[PDB]
Amino acid sequence: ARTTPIARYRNIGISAHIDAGKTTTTERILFYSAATTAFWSGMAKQYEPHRINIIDTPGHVDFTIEVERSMRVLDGAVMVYCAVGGVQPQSETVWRQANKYKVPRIAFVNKMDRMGANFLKVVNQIKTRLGANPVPLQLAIGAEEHFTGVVDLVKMKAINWNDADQGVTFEYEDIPADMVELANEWHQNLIESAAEASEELMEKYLGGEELTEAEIKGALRQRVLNNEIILVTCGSAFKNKGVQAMLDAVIDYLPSPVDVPAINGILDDGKDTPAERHASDDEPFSALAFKIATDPFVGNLTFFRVYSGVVNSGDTVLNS
RNA sequence: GGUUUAGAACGUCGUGAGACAGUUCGGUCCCUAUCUGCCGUGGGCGCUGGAGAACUGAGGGGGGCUGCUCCUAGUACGAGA
Numbered sequence A: 001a002r003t004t005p006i007a008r009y010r011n012i013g014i015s016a017h018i019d020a021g022k023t024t025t026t027e028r029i030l031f032y033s034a035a036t037t038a039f040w041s042g043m044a045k046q047y048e049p050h051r052i053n054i055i056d057t058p059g060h061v062d063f064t065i066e067v068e069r070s071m072r073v074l075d076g077a078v079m080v081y082c083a084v085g086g087v088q089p090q091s092e093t094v095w096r097q098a099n100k101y102k103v104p105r106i107a108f109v110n111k112m113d114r115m116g117a118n119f120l121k122v123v124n125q126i127k128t129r130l131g132a133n134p135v136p137l138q139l140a141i142g143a144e145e146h147f148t149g150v151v152d153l154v155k156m157k158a159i160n161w162n163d164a165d166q167g168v169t170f171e172y173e174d175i176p177a178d179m180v181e182l183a184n185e186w187h188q189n190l191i192e193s194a195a196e197a198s199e200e201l202m203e204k205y206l207g208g209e210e211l212t213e214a215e216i217k218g219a220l221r222q223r224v225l226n227n228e229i230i231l232v233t234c235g236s237a238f239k240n241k242g243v244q245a246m247l248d249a250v251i252d253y254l255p256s257p258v259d260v261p262a263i264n265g266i267l268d269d270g271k272d273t274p275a276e277r278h279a280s281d282d283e284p285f286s287a288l289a290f291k292i293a294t295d296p297f298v299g300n301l302t303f304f305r306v307y308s309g310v311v312n313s314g315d316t317v318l319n320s
Numbered sequence B: 001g002g003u004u005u006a007g008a009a010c011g012u013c014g015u016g017a018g019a020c021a022g023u024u025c026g027g028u029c030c031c032u033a034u035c036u037g038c039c040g041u042g043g044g045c046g047c048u049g050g051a052g053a054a055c056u057g058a059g060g061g062g063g064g065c066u067g068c069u070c071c072u073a074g075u076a077c078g079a080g081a
């Protein structure tokens, strides 16, 4: 029946300011509002193939409905940022849009392939202008044009990409002394933040010991889910660099339809648990038409995400 | 071609001949350049013995126009556009 298990489902939005990189990263994704899916097994053929539902958005203030009418259909948000500008007024807009629907955000600081590109500065820019509290998942290696890869704060390796074929044949590297000290600094500032998921993690670290990356990734995913933090990654979609690890972070922190509480509905008016519903293949059918389109071919075409239920080709439905 | 000749007509003016910054159709435009000027082109003598050539260069003239496309570069600027 179901081709991919619900747990292997990511509903991600790519929203940012204008020309921040959205469509470029989406093309790099298709290689490695416009809704489109993909099957990204993993970076090392790990993570048996996930089905990532990507809703590429506009970033213009003119088309703000075209992103707000997808935000409350999405389950996660991949907020893109440029590395020379970072937070723009347009970035503040879609940010407030996502805060209105309480989306668990990660961030992707694109355009590290430009002059004046920074990563620390843009992280702090996010922390000061918007209000978010970001945990840097990556850290750039190569300032503006020397940008070759990043260091992780979980694997402690360098994913320096191979620039012979576009961005697919990356290598794992020895995280050399180019930056191998700030790496430690922010790795520790990441552990200290993932400790912020349970008292039993305070007692875990406060023993003077660094816990394991498995239960650090689980803890940080819990934090993204409760919207407690935001995980920022670092890439360059135009120089075919950094995109696959942002996809990894999407797999590892963004929510599946079951990694959240149920969707609360209404039976006939506001009741106690009127029609709270959970994403399941056995529920009564329920969806939400988040977008109407005008088919060039037909003139009518309705987008919808099924929250609870399973509909069929021909099934009657109720415009509740 | 127009404008202002001699023909003819219209409207109007006048009794009329005729007339009208009124109109209309028709209606002959000559000169072999002496001088200056200019464009070329030579003859004489001169430049101090005659000749053949190669130059220097005072000075004079000619020439000086610009579009579009691509690159720098979707770079600077610009929240964006």
Ligand SMILES: Nc1nc2c(ncn2[C@@H]2O[C@H](COP(=O)(O)OP(=O)(O)O)[C@@H](O)[C@H]2O)c(=O)[nH]1
Binding pocket: A017, A018, A019, A020, A021, A022, A023, A024, A059, A110, A111, A112, A113, A114, A236, A237, A238, A239
């Ligand atoms: N230098 C550089 N240019 C990029 C990068 N990513 C995208 N671009 C350029 O941005 C231009 C338009 O961006 P676009 O994909 O439309 O993003 P949008 O503003 O969200 O629509 C393209 O011609 C790309 O070359 C990058 O990482 N570095």
